[PDB]
Write a protein that binds this ligand. Sequence first.
Ligand SMILES: [Ca+2]
Length: 243
Amino acid sequence: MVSAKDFSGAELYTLEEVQYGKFEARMKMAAASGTVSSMFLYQNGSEIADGRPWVEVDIEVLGKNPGSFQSNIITGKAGAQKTSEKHHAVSPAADQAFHTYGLEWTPNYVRWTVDGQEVRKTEGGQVSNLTGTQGLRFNLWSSESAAWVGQFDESKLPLFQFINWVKVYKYTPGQGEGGSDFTLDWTDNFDTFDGSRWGKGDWTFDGNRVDLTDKNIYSRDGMLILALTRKGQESFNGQVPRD
Ligand SMILES: [Ca+2]
């Protein structure tokens, strides 16, 4: 899908969705005023305004402040969303080093972790409204809401978000591993783009100044790269960072 938008971004998403689990991703985020660099659980179809419930859990690095990320739980329905934005410091800055971002989802709570340390845990409330299944996604784009992400600093493009690896665990309460309540299910070390596991976004949405396209996701040197660039300049010409 293609529009006249001058920029292209990326959205990586799992082809399958699941109910509950732990999701970890080792990554280095991208950040410039005006950008959004993320990791989120998402129930496909939530955007359908037919009275259907919205189910989503977010980790979003807003480009204007690379030293922190916003957490969020989105429930309710399209046009009538219920949110819970919170902010958490990340050191060193999200775009300066790799960190391990974790999301835990059970029937009773959602937990956010950075390098194994909890930064947020929500129990009940919106967690009870996270029904159904959710897929694991990551995207990199730029919001037209200057108040949320800051004025768009186009001069800083191109930008790249690097994903070293992803681990997904099944929710095994009381049956988990090492005493925990999660059992490792699968891991992707991104030595390749595995199309049997992931999809690449190929759409855009209002408020996004970029087209999400398949040309903005690729792998090199054990890293999955998400690119935010001007249209036609999606290729990465640098050296992949080491973790
Ligand atoms: Ca890797």
